[PDB]
């Protein structure tokens, strides 16, 4: 504003903020159990085992 005497004024304001977050988790598991048993009382010296 200026009248009989001059007066000067000036102001400025600016602010900026940016936040960020990122997370990712991955997991994988697997289990398999296979057992085979064979008992033969056949009566041959070789063929029973064969």
């Amino acid at each position: 504003y200026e009248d009989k005497i001059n007066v000067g004024g000036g102001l400025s304001g600016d602010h900026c903020k940016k936040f960020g977050g990122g997370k990712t988790e991955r997991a994988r598991k697997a289990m398999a159990v296979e057992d085979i048993i064979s008992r033969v009382r056949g009566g041959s010296s070789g063929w029973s085992g064969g």
């Binding site: 041959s44 010296s45 070789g46 063929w47 085992g49 064969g50």
Partner: peptide, 12 residues
């Protein structure tokens, strides 16, 4: 195979 195991059978 079967024949090789028969051979092993006679062998043992």
């Amino acid at each position: 195979d079967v024949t090789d195991f028969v051979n092993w059978a006679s062998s043992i």
